[PDB]
Write a structure and sequence with these properties.
- Chain A: This is Large ribosomal subunit protein bL20.
- The structure is cut from a larger assembly and holds chains A (about 120 residues), B (about 100 residues), C (about 150 residues), D (about 110 residues), E (about 60 residues) and F (about 140 residues).
- With about 120 residues, chain A is mostly helical.
- Chain A has 6 helices and no strands.
- Chain A has helices spanning about 10-20, 25-30, 30-70, 75-85, 90-100, 100-115.
- In chain C, helix 3 links the parallel strand 2 and strand 3 (about 120-125).
- In chain C, helix 2 crosses helix 3.
- Chain C has helices at about 50-65, 85-95, 110-115, 130-135, 145-154; strands at about 70-75, 100-105, 120-125, 140.
- A 4-stranded parallel β-sheet of chain C has the order 1-4-2-3.
- The longest helix of chain C has 18 residues, at about 50-65.
- Chain F has a 4-stranded parallel β-sheet, with helices on one face.
- In chain F, helix 1 (about 25-35) packs across helix 4.
- The termini of chain F are far apart.
- Classes of the chains: A mainly alpha (about 120), B mainly beta (about 100), C alpha/beta (about 150), D alpha+beta (about 110), E alpha+beta (about 60), F alpha/beta (about 140).
- Chains A and B meet through helix 3, helix 5 and helix 6 of A and strand 2, strand 5 and strand 8 of B.
- The complex binds arginine, magnesium ion (MG) (183 copies) and zinc ion (ZN).
- Chain A binds 3 RNA strands through helix 1, helix 2, helix 3 and helix 5.
Amino acid sequence: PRAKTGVVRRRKHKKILKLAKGYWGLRSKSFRKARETLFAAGNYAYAHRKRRKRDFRRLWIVRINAACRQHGLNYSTFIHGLKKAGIEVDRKNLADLAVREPQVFAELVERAKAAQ
Amino acid sequence: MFAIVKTGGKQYRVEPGLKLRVEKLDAEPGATVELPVLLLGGEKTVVGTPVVEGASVVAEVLGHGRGKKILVSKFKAKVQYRRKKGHRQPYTELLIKEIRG
Amino acid sequence: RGEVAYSGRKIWPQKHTGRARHGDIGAPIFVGGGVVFGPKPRDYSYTLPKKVRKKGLAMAVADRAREGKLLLVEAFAGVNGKTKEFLAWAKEAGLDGSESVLLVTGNELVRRAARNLPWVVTLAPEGLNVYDIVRTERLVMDLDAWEVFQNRIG
Amino acid sequence: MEAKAIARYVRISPRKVRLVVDLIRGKSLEEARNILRYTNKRGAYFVAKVLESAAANAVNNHDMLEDRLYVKAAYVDEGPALKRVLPRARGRADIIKKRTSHITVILGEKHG
Amino acid sequence: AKHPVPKKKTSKARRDARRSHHALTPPTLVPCPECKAMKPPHTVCPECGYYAGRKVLEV
Amino acid sequence: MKTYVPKQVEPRWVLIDAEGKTLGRLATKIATLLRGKHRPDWTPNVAMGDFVVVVNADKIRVTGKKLEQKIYTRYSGYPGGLKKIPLEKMLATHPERVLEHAVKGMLPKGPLGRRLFKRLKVYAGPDHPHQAQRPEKLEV
RNA sequence: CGUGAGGGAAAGGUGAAAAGAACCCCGGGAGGGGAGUGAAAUAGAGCCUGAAACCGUGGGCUUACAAGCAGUCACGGCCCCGAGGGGUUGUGGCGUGCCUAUUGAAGCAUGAGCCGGCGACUCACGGUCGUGGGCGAGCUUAAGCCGUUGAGGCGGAGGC
RNA sequence: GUGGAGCCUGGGAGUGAGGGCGCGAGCGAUAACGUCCGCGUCCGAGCGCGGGAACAACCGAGACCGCCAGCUAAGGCCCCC
RNA sequence: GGAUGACCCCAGGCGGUAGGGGAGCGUUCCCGAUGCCGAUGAAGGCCGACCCGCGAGGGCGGCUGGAGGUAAGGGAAGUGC
Ligand SMILES: NC(=[NH2+])NCCC[C@H](N)C(=O)O
Ligand SMILES: [Mg+2]
Ligand SMILES: [Mg+2]
Ligand SMILES: [Mg+2]
Ligand SMILES: [Mg+2]
Ligand SMILES: [Mg+2]
Ligand SMILES: [Mg+2]
Ligand SMILES: [Mg+2]
Ligand SMILES: [Mg+2]
Ligand SMILES: [Mg+2]
Ligand SMILES: [Mg+2]
Ligand SMILES: [Mg+2]
Ligand SMILES: [Mg+2]
Ligand SMILES: [Mg+2]
Ligand SMILES: [Mg+2]
Ligand SMILES: [Mg+2]
Ligand SMILES: [Mg+2]
Ligand SMILES: [Mg+2]
Ligand SMILES: [Mg+2]
Ligand SMILES: [Mg+2]
Ligand SMILES: [Mg+2]
Ligand SMILES: [Mg+2]
Ligand SMILES: [Mg+2]
Ligand SMILES: [Mg+2]
Ligand SMILES: [Mg+2]
Ligand SMILES: [Mg+2]
Ligand SMILES: [Mg+2]
Ligand SMILES: [Mg+2]
Ligand SMILES: [Mg+2]
Ligand SMILES: [Mg+2]
Ligand SMILES: [Mg+2]
Ligand SMILES: [Mg+2]
Ligand SMILES: [Mg+2]
Ligand SMILES: [Mg+2]
Ligand SMILES: [Mg+2]
Ligand SMILES: [Mg+2]
Ligand SMILES: [Mg+2]
Ligand SMILES: [Mg+2]
Ligand SMILES: [Mg+2]
Ligand SMILES: [Mg+2]
Ligand SMILES: [Mg+2]
Ligand SMILES: [Mg+2]
Ligand SMILES: [Mg+2]
Ligand SMILES: [Mg+2]
Ligand SMILES: [Mg+2]
Ligand SMILES: [Mg+2]
Ligand SMILES: [Mg+2]
Ligand SMILES: [Mg+2]
Ligand SMILES: [Mg+2]
Ligand SMILES: [Mg+2]
Ligand SMILES: [Mg+2]
Ligand SMILES: [Mg+2]
Ligand SMILES: [Mg+2]
Ligand SMILES: [Mg+2]
Ligand SMILES: [Mg+2]
Ligand SMILES: [Mg+2]
Ligand SMILES: [Mg+2]
Ligand SMILES: [Mg+2]
Ligand SMILES: [Mg+2]
Ligand SMILES: [Mg+2]
Ligand SMILES: [Mg+2]
Ligand SMILES: [Mg+2]
Ligand SMILES: [Mg+2]
Ligand SMILES: [Mg+2]
Ligand SMILES: [Mg+2]
Ligand SMILES: [Mg+2]
Ligand SMILES: [Mg+2]
Ligand SMILES: [Mg+2]
Ligand SMILES: [Mg+2]
Ligand SMILES: [Mg+2]
Ligand SMILES: [Mg+2]
Ligand SMILES: [Mg+2]
Ligand SMILES: [Mg+2]
Ligand SMILES: [Mg+2]
Ligand SMILES: [Mg+2]
Ligand SMILES: [Mg+2]
Ligand SMILES: [Mg+2]
Ligand SMILES: [Mg+2]
Ligand SMILES: [Mg+2]
Ligand SMILES: [Mg+2]
Ligand SMILES: [Mg+2]
Ligand SMILES: [Mg+2]
Ligand SMILES: [Mg+2]
Ligand SMILES: [Mg+2]
Ligand SMILES: [Mg+2]
Ligand SMILES: [Mg+2]
Ligand SMILES: [Mg+2]
Ligand SMILES: [Mg+2]
Ligand SMILES: [Mg+2]
Ligand SMILES: [Mg+2]
Ligand SMILES: [Mg+2]
Ligand SMILES: [Mg+2]
Ligand SMILES: [Mg+2]
Ligand SMILES: [Mg+2]
Ligand SMILES: [Mg+2]
Ligand SMILES: [Mg+2]
Ligand SMILES: [Mg+2]
Ligand SMILES: [Mg+2]
Ligand SMILES: [Mg+2]
Ligand SMILES: [Mg+2]
Ligand SMILES: [Mg+2]
Ligand SMILES: [Mg+2]
Ligand SMILES: [Mg+2]
Ligand SMILES: [Mg+2]
Ligand SMILES: [Mg+2]
Ligand SMILES: [Mg+2]
Ligand SMILES: [Mg+2]
Ligand SMILES: [Mg+2]
Ligand SMILES: [Mg+2]
Ligand SMILES: [Mg+2]
Ligand SMILES: [Mg+2]
Ligand SMILES: [Mg+2]
Ligand SMILES: [Mg+2]
Ligand SMILES: [Mg+2]
Ligand SMILES: [Mg+2]
Ligand SMILES: [Mg+2]
Ligand SMILES: [Mg+2]
Ligand SMILES: [Mg+2]
Ligand SMILES: [Mg+2]
Ligand SMILES: [Mg+2]
Ligand SMILES: [Mg+2]
Ligand SMILES: [Mg+2]
Ligand SMILES: [Mg+2]
Ligand SMILES: [Mg+2]
Ligand SMILES: [Mg+2]
Ligand SMILES: [Mg+2]
Ligand SMILES: [Mg+2]
Ligand SMILES: [Mg+2]
Ligand SMILES: [Mg+2]
Ligand SMILES: [Mg+2]
Ligand SMILES: [Mg+2]
Ligand SMILES: [Mg+2]
Ligand SMILES: [Mg+2]
Ligand SMILES: [Mg+2]
Ligand SMILES: [Mg+2]
Ligand SMILES: [Mg+2]
Ligand SMILES: [Mg+2]
Ligand SMILES: [Mg+2]
Ligand SMILES: [Mg+2]
Ligand SMILES: [Mg+2]
Ligand SMILES: [Mg+2]
Ligand SMILES: [Mg+2]
Ligand SMILES: [Mg+2]
Ligand SMILES: [Mg+2]
Ligand SMILES: [Mg+2]
Ligand SMILES: [Mg+2]
Ligand SMILES: [Mg+2]
Ligand SMILES: [Mg+2]
Ligand SMILES: [Mg+2]
Ligand SMILES: [Mg+2]
Ligand SMILES: [Mg+2]
Ligand SMILES: [Mg+2]
Ligand SMILES: [Mg+2]
Ligand SMILES: [Mg+2]
Ligand SMILES: [Mg+2]
Ligand SMILES: [Mg+2]
Ligand SMILES: [Mg+2]
Ligand SMILES: [Mg+2]
Ligand SMILES: [Mg+2]
Ligand SMILES: [Mg+2]
Ligand SMILES: [Mg+2]
Ligand SMILES: [Mg+2]
Ligand SMILES: [Mg+2]
Ligand SMILES: [Mg+2]
Ligand SMILES: [Mg+2]
Ligand SMILES: [Mg+2]
Ligand SMILES: [Mg+2]
Ligand SMILES: [Mg+2]
Ligand SMILES: [Mg+2]
Ligand SMILES: [Mg+2]
Ligand SMILES: [Mg+2]
Ligand SMILES: [Mg+2]
Ligand SMILES: [Mg+2]
Ligand SMILES: [Mg+2]
Ligand SMILES: [Mg+2]
Ligand SMILES: [Mg+2]
Ligand SMILES: [Mg+2]
Ligand SMILES: [Mg+2]
Ligand SMILES: [Mg+2]
Ligand SMILES: [Mg+2]
Ligand SMILES: [Mg+2]
Ligand SMILES: [Mg+2]
Ligand SMILES: [Mg+2]
Ligand SMILES: [Mg+2]
Ligand SMILES: [Zn+2]
């Protein structure tokens, strides 16, 4: 029996093109350019999931640094103090406290100065 | 009153009435669980070293789910290497009931 | 590509046309060209060992016997070649047509009467084979047919 | 209520007629008629004809009032091309495409 | 010369941008003071054959 | 919980006296203010730093022999279009540019970074025309 | 097409039934709009289905101080569907196409305009391992012959 | 010393253009992103990740997937960062 | 563990070119099928933010289409661009 392509290739090309919706020019219209665009897209997504974790830690740290310097110490001193005090609140929540709960953060700062 | 709790290797600021998604807990839907407390705030401030001895947050597990599928896709040029993996992160959904100081 | 109707001529020069190189238009790379490794007339038969098929024959009958779906009969009463007659007989024999039946007999008149029934497959005992046994829910045999069968598997 | 006309397989290049159709999109029938009349393009003849066919349809078939009519939508689509050989130097034959247009005019009524 | 040639197909975007100057400007028309028909200014009215308030042309 | 993002805030206008200060060490601080990195709600993709007013930019200071050896450079795009201007001459002609250049070089490149530079107002001489914004005096 | 020997295409489908659209209307015609036929008329003869490239009309978001393998991660704005999602993308982070060939390519090394369809590890006989079964000092038939008319059997010559 | 260790029999390969670096020599000129061997390594195949401005093979380190959590490596902590 | 791919628990491995091995998806055709799905709508087409699957894919729903399609389990190839 003969088994011609028939339906199969069109359906595969459609899967790819649907994923490429939104892409510029031929990157969303041509199967070939869509597929190339997607290769890169997937690698970026993987790399940037990893990178997103670093991106946010850097942001927290910057905010934490600014909140600390309002109370007369820098970030690196503040983190040492927290360590000596045994306080384990992470940078994500430190940064939140620094903005949403300035009294609590100021309290944390005291403990950190004292612990040293 | 808010508490900073620790579950699934991560920390969250919770309050009564908060619905929260966390890493999957080994606990039946409808059960209630108690989360370790790192810090208390709002009216009174108490600071854990690292956790506060007395306190706990009571949470009702609303249920477990699977996250929206993420396409983890790998490609190496000029080497015919392509990998396509579908990933759905399991989670437990919690309803924060009370902060027991 | 050797059997297709085109000429063996090189369709254009090897070099300097600015196109891909080609020989004749019979090459499978051409629409309308020869096909690569397409089917050719082929004999699918092979000699399955005699003992295997004899054993298979015995086992197939055994399976039906183990289920209580093997029935032998001495004669076929009044069936003289009419389907209506076989039907009447079948009813008494417990064959209501709710089960498919492989009917094995040397009686031509019986085979003619039953052969047009959708639920009946008919065979002379020399033709007993395991595909037809396994195809059907019930096995019905002549004492005579049962005998040539026992000779065959002996 | 809308009225519409289509002139299909008009032997003129679509890119050329569109230039003209763009001139009358959204215009009142009377304004369109004046524009087409003094537009110095071959396409004006064809778009005028379709315009008028649509106006007649409006009045005669669809109970619309001529004095209320405006070009509510209009566009040109490509028809099948007529392919023709254009002989070049050194024995080369090029293919000229003599293109074709489907011209649509749609009239509506501007109330009040 | 050595037969210059386009290096890349022009994109739909760039092609259509080159044409941003191609739209026709409508013919400029005024009413004919005699018969009120629209016509180009400074031309003899084709509808009534008047120009400068007098008959010039059989129309 | 998602990291806090600020709704737009009324920026804070700040006034700085440049007299006697070391050119580069003052610049780093103006940049920080411009970026708004001194604020606990700092967000990297919006303009939310301070507006910085600077006076006595002509009295900026510099160590070593830089007055005559630091060369500002400009390329016109034309053959031989490399222009070389020493610090002394820049101070004697467009003094405010010295700080401006120092700070601009310390801001991120890009649209936001360019926007941040516009929030810097540098004046030679003790005065600025910004009383209307009532700049808060800053010791740095 | 070729002097000639010779080479050598493309091109199938309305509907159940032509009932293949009288007549009116714009138009020189083509074409269309009504009427009408039909279960259906984007089944109307340039006719089943009607993908994709490609072209256009309308709408939402967006864009004229901006540096780009065109995406991706984050946040914010607007629109839409109704602690959620979809669309769009302002700013910020990161970011050297695909394939081939190479010690080494984003590479200024090969190939590809784009889309659709055709397109390359097979079959026979023999061998050699492995493997699922049959039988086991034995295993097995070939050509044929009889039967069947999608029935199987006989056949020991011969082979190991 | 229990390791994607080893040995034995058999089935299937691919490879037989290497390249950089360190050390040891020859050739070259105490030249070459040179050439030819030896021991090792990495790239090749890790043009995946951090550092080195950028950069296969230098330093750090062997990427199953997810996380808006923590600790470190080299390298860094005036601003771009 | 439990006895046997029943599922759970603890642990360790899981970068990868040439290449070896394993397990699957889908296409055409045969048996299953004198059956079964089908005009209360087959195949094919167009959507989908929904469900299952690691994935290749498979469902389901809306629209189109208007007459075919074909299960569990097996068989054979002109089988995936
Ligand atoms: N003698 C026989 N009954 N042979 C088998 C049946 C013949 C025929 N194929 C049928 O089914 O009608
Ligand atoms: Mg094919
Ligand atoms: Mg096909
Ligand atoms: Mg296909
Ligand atoms: Mg494909
Ligand atoms: Mg399809
Ligand atoms: Mg597919
Ligand atoms: Mg987009
Ligand atoms: Mg596009
Ligand atoms: Mg475009
Ligand atoms: Mg397209
Ligand atoms: Mg990742
Ligand atoms: Mg990364
Ligand atoms: Mg990390
Ligand atoms: Mg300090
Ligand atoms: Mg520490
Ligand atoms: Mg810590
Ligand atoms: Mg924990
Ligand atoms: Mg709430
Ligand atoms: Mg989660
Ligand atoms: Mg989880
Ligand atoms: Mg992919
Ligand atoms: Mg490549
Ligand atoms: Mg690459
Ligand atoms: Mg690579
Ligand atoms: Mg490749
Ligand atoms: Mg390579
Ligand atoms: Mg690849
Ligand atoms: Mg040939
Ligand atoms: Mg031939
Ligand atoms: Mg031939
Ligand atoms: Mg011939
Ligand atoms: Mg021939
Ligand atoms: Mg020949
Ligand atoms: Mg020949
Ligand atoms: Mg020849
Ligand atoms: Mg040739
Ligand atoms: Mg050549
Ligand atoms: Mg060419
Ligand atoms: Mg060619
Ligand atoms: Mg060519
Ligand atoms: Mg050929
Ligand atoms: Mg040939
Ligand atoms: Mg030929
Ligand atoms: Mg042909
Ligand atoms: Mg053929
Ligand atoms: Mg072929
Ligand atoms: Mg062949
Ligand atoms: Mg061939
Ligand atoms: Mg044959
Ligand atoms: Mg075979
Ligand atoms: Mg045979
Ligand atoms: Mg029959
Ligand atoms: Mg029958
Ligand atoms: Mg049957
Ligand atoms: Mg039968
Ligand atoms: Mg004109
Ligand atoms: Mg009229
Ligand atoms: Mg000419
Ligand atoms: Mg010629
Ligand atoms: Mg020629
Ligand atoms: Mg000639
Ligand atoms: Mg052309
Ligand atoms: Mg042409
Ligand atoms: Mg010349
Ligand atoms: Mg020349
Ligand atoms: Mg020239
Ligand atoms: Mg010349
Ligand atoms: Mg030329
Ligand atoms: Mg060129
Ligand atoms: Mg366009
Ligand atoms: Mg252009
Ligand atoms: Mg007249
Ligand atoms: Mg400061
Ligand atoms: Mg100095
Ligand atoms: Mg000046
Ligand atoms: Mg800078
Ligand atoms: Mg940068
Ligand atoms: Mg000749
Ligand atoms: Mg002739
Ligand atoms: Mg010939
Ligand atoms: Mg028909
Ligand atoms: Mg017909
Ligand atoms: Mg019908
Ligand atoms: Mg007429
Ligand atoms: Mg007329
Ligand atoms: Mg007509
Ligand atoms: Mg009309
Ligand atoms: Mg008509
Ligand atoms: Mg009707
Ligand atoms: Mg109906
Ligand atoms: Mg229908
Ligand atoms: Mg239709
Ligand atoms: Mg139809
Ligand atoms: Mg039909
Ligand atoms: Mg059609
Ligand atoms: Mg069509
Ligand atoms: Mg548009
Ligand atoms: Mg500027
Ligand atoms: Mg702008
Ligand atoms: Mg970006
Ligand atoms: Mg962010
Ligand atoms: Mg949204
Ligand atoms: Mg988005
Ligand atoms: Mg968004
Ligand atoms: Mg950042
Ligand atoms: Mg690049
Ligand atoms: Mg590179
Ligand atoms: Mg590719
Ligand atoms: Mg290639
Ligand atoms: Mg090569
Ligand atoms: Mg080479
Ligand atoms: Mg080379
Ligand atoms: Mg390039
Ligand atoms: Mg290039
Ligand atoms: Mg070349
Ligand atoms: Mg190239
Ligand atoms: Mg070559
Ligand atoms: Mg070409
Ligand atoms: Mg294209
Ligand atoms: Mg194709
Ligand atoms: Mg083979
Ligand atoms: Mg073959
Ligand atoms: Mg073979
Ligand atoms: Mg073999
Ligand atoms: Mg064997
Ligand atoms: Mg046997
Ligand atoms: Mg025998
Ligand atoms: Mg022999
Ligand atoms: Mg072992
Ligand atoms: Mg190993
Ligand atoms: Mg080994
Ligand atoms: Mg093997
Ligand atoms: Mg093999
Ligand atoms: Mg080799
Ligand atoms: Mg070899
Ligand atoms: Mg060799
Ligand atoms: Mg060699
Ligand atoms: Mg070599
Ligand atoms: Mg060597
Ligand atoms: Mg060598
Ligand atoms: Mg070395
Ligand atoms: Mg050393
Ligand atoms: Mg050495
Ligand atoms: Mg030596
Ligand atoms: Mg070398
Ligand atoms: Mg050397
Ligand atoms: Mg040397
Ligand atoms: Mg080496
Ligand atoms: Mg290689
Ligand atoms: Mg490495
Ligand atoms: Mg390695
Ligand atoms: Mg690399
Ligand atoms: Mg990188
Ligand atoms: Mg590196
Ligand atoms: Mg680097
Ligand atoms: Mg760097
Ligand atoms: Mg490098
Ligand atoms: Mg290198
Ligand atoms: Mg590397
Ligand atoms: Mg690993
Ligand atoms: Mg640390
Ligand atoms: Mg260090
Ligand atoms: Mg540095
Ligand atoms: Mg910093
Ligand atoms: Mg692997
Ligand atoms: Mg294996
Ligand atoms: Mg399969
Ligand atoms: Mg397939
Ligand atoms: Mg067949
Ligand atoms: Mg059948
Ligand atoms: Mg059937
Ligand atoms: Mg039914
Ligand atoms: Mg329907
Ligand atoms: Mg089919
Ligand atoms: Mg699907
Ligand atoms: Mg359908
Ligand atoms: Mg039929
Ligand atoms: Mg199917
Ligand atoms: Mg089937
Ligand atoms: Mg099956
Ligand atoms: Mg079977
Ligand atoms: Mg076959
Ligand atoms: Mg093939
Ligand atoms: Zn007049």
